[PDB]
Design a protein around this ligand. Structure first.
Ligand SMILES: O=C(O)C1=C[C@H](O)[C@@H](OS(=O)(=O)O)[C@H](O[C@H]2[C@H](O)[C@@H](NS(=O)(=O)O)[C@@H](O[C@H]3[C@H](O)[C@@H](OS(=O)(=O)O)[C@H](O[C@H]4[C@H](O)[C@@H](NS(=O)(=O)O)[C@@H](O)O[C@@H]4COS(=O)(=O)O)O[C@H]3C(=O)O)O[C@@H]2COS(=O)(=O)O)O1
Ligand SMILES: [Ca+2]
Ligand SMILES: [Ca+2]
Ligand SMILES: [Ca+2]
Ligand SMILES: [Ca+2]
Ligand SMILES: [Ca+2]
Length: 308
């Protein structure tokens, strides 16, 4: 059914139409997989001898341009470019750096590290170091390696219990905090293993893992731990909460809204939508529809995949 040559032709016609036909551009690109969009990009240059990304940057503008250009990048290229943006200058946008690093899998991070190095001619780890400090740096650097332990054939309940007590001994139980212990356990163990550790943790601590973080640490280190634990406990819900935060109240934090819709549209959007509706009462579709307008809105609603 998919025809890259046909799509590229229709996009070119839309770009050259007087005033630019954004609707057609959105209708096509937001209804094609990332892989198909790559095929469309090669077909476009093959036909016009011009790069699609460049053509669209000139033809589009505002939030819509941001969405479209983001969709044209491969998953790794997009994440790599988003990370670079968060660390730009004094990289004061720690929240974006945290979101990406705390949610990507070993496989995703392996490709991100590779592409980041190819695109910016520098190791992702070095830029992270420059935009982080203290234990916050140690945690982010560790996570970015994407070297989380694999899932064993058999569940190690003895270790699960061990880690749970260690987490407790390292924080709430003692004066101060043994941050390195928290970092080692939360970055080295597999996600599934940690989901069980956090459950078992409730048997030793009167505060769950999240509340324990709020009482033990502060600042970016605290926020990084909060994002990590949330994502480990329930990734779809984590993104649903970040999305809600990006639209609640006056205005919109477009940087977050666009990045999540673009990066998770083909990953777990169905689960994100379900968690969103369950917690916020309204559908994600409804929130997007109410916080944005025009072609930009249309594009995001297509990435949403539907109403709930
Ligand atoms: O939640 C609010 O912050 C908010 C809600 C209320 O609706 C209203 O509050 S009230 O007390 O006045 O009653 C007020 O509305 C805001 C709106 O929230 C702002 N959006 S934000 O910038 O994202 O924070 C903003 O909206 C204007 C923006 O330029 C833009 O909004 S959005 O689509 O990004 O959400 C939109 O402008 C274009 C839009 O970019 C185009 N998109 S396309 O992809 O190119 O097709 C397209 O949709 O057209 C619109 C409108 O174009 S026009 O304005 O040139 O005709 O909408 C803008 C707008 O509606 O003004 O500002 C409004 C109004 O706030 S103000 O203080 O009265 O100026 O706040
Ligand atoms: Ca137009
Ligand atoms: Ca432009
Ligand atoms: Ca303590
Ligand atoms: Ca809003
Ligand atoms: Ca808005």
């Amino acid at each position: 059914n998919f025809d890259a040559e046909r799509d590229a032709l229709n996009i070119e016609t839309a770009i050259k139409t007087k005033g630019v036909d954004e609707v057609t551009i959105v209708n096509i690109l937001t209804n094609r997989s990332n892989a198909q969009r790559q095929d469309i990009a090669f077909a476009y240059q093959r036909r016009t001898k011009k790069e699609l990304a460049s053509a669209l940057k000139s033809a589009l503008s505002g939030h819509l341009e941001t969405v479209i250009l983001g969709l044209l990048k491969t998953p790794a290229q997009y994440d790599a470019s988003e990370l670079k943006a968060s660390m730009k200058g004094l990289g004061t946008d720690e929240d974006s750096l945290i979101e990406i690093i705390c949610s990507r899998t070993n496989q995703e991070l392996q490709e991100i590290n590779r592409v980041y190095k190819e695109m910016y001619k520098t190791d992702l780890e070095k830029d992270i170091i420059s935009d982080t400090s203290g234990d916050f740096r140690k945690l982010m650097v560790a996570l970015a390696k994407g070297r989380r332990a694999e899932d064993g054939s058999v569940i190690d309940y003895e270790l699960i219990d061990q880690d749970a007590r260690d987490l407790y001994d390292a924080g709430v139980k003692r004066k101060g905090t043994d941050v390195p212990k928290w970092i080692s356990i939360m970055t080295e163990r597999s996600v599934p293993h940690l989901q069980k550790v956090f459950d078992r943790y409730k048997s030793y601590s009167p505060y769950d893992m999240l509340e324990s973080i709020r009482k033990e640490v502060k600042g970016d280190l605290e926020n990084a731990f909060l994002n990590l634990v949330q994502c480990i406990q329930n990734k779809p819900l984590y993104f649903a909460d970040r999305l809600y935060d990006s639209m609640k109240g006056k205005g919109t934090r477009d940087k977050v809204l666009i990045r999540i819709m673009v990066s998770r549209s083909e990953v777990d959007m169905l689960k994100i939508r379900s968690e969103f509706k369950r917690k916020y009462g309204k559908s994600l579709y409804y929130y997007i529809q109410q916080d944005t307008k025009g072609d930009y809105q249309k594009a995001l609603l297509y990435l949403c995949g539907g109403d709930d």
